[PDB]
Short mmCIF file of C-alpha atoms in Angstrom, two decimals:
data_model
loop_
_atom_site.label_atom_id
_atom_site.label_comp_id
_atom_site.label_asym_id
_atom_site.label_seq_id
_atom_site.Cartn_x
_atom_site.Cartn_y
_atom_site.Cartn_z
CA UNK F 51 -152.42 15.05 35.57
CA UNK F 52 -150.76 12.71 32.79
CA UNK F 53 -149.83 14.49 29.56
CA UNK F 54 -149.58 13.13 26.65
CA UNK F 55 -147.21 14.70 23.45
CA UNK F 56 -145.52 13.82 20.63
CA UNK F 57 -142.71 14.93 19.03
CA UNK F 58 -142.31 17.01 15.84
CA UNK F 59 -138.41 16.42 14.83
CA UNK F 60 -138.32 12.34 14.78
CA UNK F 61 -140.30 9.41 13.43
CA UNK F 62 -139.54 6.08 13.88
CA UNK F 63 -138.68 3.60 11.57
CA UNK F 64 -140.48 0.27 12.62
CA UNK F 65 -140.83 -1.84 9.84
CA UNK F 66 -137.85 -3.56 7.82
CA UNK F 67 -139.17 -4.59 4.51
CA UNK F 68 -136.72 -7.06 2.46
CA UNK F 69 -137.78 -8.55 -0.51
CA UNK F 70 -136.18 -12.10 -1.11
CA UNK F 71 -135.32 -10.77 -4.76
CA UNK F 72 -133.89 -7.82 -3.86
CA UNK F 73 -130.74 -10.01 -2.47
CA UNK F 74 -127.94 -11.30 -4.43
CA UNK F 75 -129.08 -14.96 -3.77
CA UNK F 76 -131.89 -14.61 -6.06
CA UNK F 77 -129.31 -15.83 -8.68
CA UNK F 78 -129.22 -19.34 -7.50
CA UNK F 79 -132.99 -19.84 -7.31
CA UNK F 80 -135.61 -20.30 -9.94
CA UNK F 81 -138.67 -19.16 -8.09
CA UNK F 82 -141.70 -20.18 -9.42
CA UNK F 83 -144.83 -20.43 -7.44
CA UNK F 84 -147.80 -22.68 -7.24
CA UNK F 85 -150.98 -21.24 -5.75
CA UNK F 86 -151.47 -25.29 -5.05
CA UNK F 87 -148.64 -26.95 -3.69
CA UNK F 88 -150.86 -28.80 -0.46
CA UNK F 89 -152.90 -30.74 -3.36
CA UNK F 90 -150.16 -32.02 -5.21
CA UNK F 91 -148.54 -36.03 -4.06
CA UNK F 92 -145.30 -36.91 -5.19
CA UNK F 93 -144.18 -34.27 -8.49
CA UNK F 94 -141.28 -35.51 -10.56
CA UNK F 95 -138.69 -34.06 -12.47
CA UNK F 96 -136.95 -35.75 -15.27
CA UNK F 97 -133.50 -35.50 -16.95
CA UNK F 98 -132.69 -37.10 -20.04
CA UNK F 99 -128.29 -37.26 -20.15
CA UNK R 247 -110.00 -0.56 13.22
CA UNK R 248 -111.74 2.64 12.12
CA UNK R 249 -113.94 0.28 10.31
CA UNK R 250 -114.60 -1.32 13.12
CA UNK R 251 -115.18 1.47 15.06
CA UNK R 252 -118.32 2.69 12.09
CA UNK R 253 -119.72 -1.08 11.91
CA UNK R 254 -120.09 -2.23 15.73
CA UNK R 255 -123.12 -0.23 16.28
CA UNK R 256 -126.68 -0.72 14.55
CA UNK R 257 -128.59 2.33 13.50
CA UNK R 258 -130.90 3.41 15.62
CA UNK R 259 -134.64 4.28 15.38
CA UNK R 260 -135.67 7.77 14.77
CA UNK R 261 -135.80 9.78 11.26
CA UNK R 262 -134.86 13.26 12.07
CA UNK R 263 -136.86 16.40 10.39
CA UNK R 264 -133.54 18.07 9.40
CA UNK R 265 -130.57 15.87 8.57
CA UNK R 266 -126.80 17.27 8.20
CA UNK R 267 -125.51 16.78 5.45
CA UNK R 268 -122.60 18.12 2.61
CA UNK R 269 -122.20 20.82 0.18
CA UNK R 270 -122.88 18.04 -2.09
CA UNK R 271 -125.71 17.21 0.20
CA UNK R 272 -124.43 13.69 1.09
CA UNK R 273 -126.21 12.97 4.63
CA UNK R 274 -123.96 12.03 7.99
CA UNK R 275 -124.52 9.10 9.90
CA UNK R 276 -121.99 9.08 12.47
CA UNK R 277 -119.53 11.46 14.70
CA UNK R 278 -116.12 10.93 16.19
CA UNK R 279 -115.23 12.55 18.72
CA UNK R 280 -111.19 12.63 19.73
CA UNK R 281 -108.80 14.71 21.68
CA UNK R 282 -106.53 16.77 20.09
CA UNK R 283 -102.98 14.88 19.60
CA UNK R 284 -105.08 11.69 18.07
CA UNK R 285 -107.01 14.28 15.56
CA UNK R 286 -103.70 15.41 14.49
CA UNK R 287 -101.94 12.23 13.93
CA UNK R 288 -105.22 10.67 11.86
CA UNK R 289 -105.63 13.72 9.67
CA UNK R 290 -101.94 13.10 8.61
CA UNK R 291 -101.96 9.69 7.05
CA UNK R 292 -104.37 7.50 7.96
CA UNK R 293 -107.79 9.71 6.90
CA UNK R 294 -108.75 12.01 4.14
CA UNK R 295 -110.93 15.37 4.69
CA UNK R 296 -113.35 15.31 2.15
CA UNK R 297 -115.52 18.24 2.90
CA UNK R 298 -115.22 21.41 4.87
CA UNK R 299 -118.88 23.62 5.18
CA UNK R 300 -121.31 21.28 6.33
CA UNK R 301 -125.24 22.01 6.08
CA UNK R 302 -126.80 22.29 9.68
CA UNK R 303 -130.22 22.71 11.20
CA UNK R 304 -130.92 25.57 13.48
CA UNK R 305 -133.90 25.46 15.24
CA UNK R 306 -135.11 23.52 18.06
CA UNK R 307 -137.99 20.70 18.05
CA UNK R 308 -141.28 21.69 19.16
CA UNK R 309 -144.26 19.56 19.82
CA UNK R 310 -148.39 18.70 19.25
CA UNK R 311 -149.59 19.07 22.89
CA UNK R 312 -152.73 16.90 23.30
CA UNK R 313 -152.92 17.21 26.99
CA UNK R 314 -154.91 15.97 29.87
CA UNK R 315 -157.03 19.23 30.61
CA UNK R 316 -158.24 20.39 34.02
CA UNK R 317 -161.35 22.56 34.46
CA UNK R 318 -161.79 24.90 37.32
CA UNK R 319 -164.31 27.50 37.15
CA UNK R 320 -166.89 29.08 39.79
CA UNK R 321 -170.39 29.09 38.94
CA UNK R 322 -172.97 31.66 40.22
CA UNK R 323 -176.34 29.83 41.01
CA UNK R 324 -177.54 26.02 40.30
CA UNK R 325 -179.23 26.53 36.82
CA UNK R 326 -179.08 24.28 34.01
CA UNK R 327 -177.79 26.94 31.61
CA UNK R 328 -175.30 28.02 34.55
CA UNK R 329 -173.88 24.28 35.10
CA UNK R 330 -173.23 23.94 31.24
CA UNK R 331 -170.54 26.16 31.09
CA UNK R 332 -168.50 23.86 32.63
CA UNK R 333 -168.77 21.49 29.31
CA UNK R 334 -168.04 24.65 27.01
CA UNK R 335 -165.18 25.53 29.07
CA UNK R 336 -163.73 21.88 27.99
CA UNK R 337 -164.48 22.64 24.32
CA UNK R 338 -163.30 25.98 24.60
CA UNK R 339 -159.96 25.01 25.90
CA UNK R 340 -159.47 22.05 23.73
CA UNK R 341 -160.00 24.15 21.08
CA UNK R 342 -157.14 26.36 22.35
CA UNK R 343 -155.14 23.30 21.65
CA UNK R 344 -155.73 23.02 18.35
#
């Protein structure tokens, strides 16, 4: 005889969602995404002082 | 070191139905628990009360039972109709559950 219940006054919490842009850091990236990085060689940037 | 005492421990799991809270409604998450010469001496300078009347729950838990069931019944005879009511008397009492 092996009952099984379940309670009615407390529910977990399992999952701990953070969102990279909900921190502070956020600042010091500019996050812009390819949906094709793998296909890409060498990509340059230039700067012209 | 009372901030040290409210930031050692991480919060645990469950979500409670009914949660204390204020007159303002502000929820509690914690509870310190002191003898009575240290809860005079922190109430003086080194705390502030902030609320008085606190909103509590009252009643108990209860729970969804979903149970393993045990038949036991006598049967008269050896029909078919006769050895059936075995198999309502798990859907009658697992209706009973519900």
């Amino acid at each position: 005889d092996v009952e099984f219940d379940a309670l009615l006054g407390s529910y977990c919490n399992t999952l701990s969602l953070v969102r990279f842009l909900e921190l502070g850091l956020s600042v010091a990236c500019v996050c812009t995404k390819f949906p094709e990085l793998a296909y890409m060689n060498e990509g340059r940037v230039q700067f012209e002082v | 070191w009372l901030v040290d005492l409210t930031t050692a421990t991480q919060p645990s799991v469950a979500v409670p139905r009914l949660t204390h809270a204020d007159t303002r409604g502000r929820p509690v998450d914690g509870v310190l628990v002191t003898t009575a010469p240290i809860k005079q001496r922190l109430l003086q300078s080194f705390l502030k009360v902030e609320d008085t009347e606190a909103d509590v729950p009252v009643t108990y838990g209860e729970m969804v039972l979903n149970g393993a069931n045990l038949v036991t019944a006598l049967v008269m005879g050896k029909a078919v109709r006769s050895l059936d009511d075995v198999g309502r008397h798990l859907l009658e009492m697992q209706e009973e559950q519900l």
